[PDB]
Amino acid sequence: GSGNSASQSPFSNPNTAEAFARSFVSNIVSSGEFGAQGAEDFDDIIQSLIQAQSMGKGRHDTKAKAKAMQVALASSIAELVIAESSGGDVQRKTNVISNALRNALMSTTGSPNEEFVHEVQDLIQMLSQEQINEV
């Protein structure tokens, strides 16, 4: 990961994505008290995010793959949360990730975008009520 400017989308810029993932999980360590999953497992997600970029998940187009990455990442968080939400309160635990995510944005772009957080939260809550797991 490198310090790149004009980092509007952290998912289109591989260097920014690396920093986003590492910063997010760094927040997650404090967050970890909300689940048995632990910040430890999230390190794998960092590796996954980096590899997925080079592999080419979503689409070949950098802009499109970036947009797909943020959705996929939110889905990844849901998978983690739904498991843990089976042993606690959904809103409380969802809020914890929101706390980690918000700081991650502030650290990487300098702009706290609640919209993305709400989208992640809505996604988790939606799949929480609906209960659908895609293998």
Whether residue 66 contacts residue 11, with contact meaning beta carbons closer than 8 Å, is answered with yes
Which method resolved this structure?
A: NMR
Determine the Cα–Cα distance for residues 6 and 1; give it in Å rounded to an integer. Answer: 15
The DSSP output letter for 135 is -
Domain segments of the chain: what residues?
14-131
Distances (CA, A) of 65 to 61, 81, 85, 96, 109: 6, 24, 29, 27, 19
CA R_g for the chain: 14
Q: In sequence order, what DSSP letters do the residues of 55-98 get, joined into one string?
A: HT-S-SSHHHHHHHHHHHHHHHHHHHHHHHGGGS-HHHHHHHHH
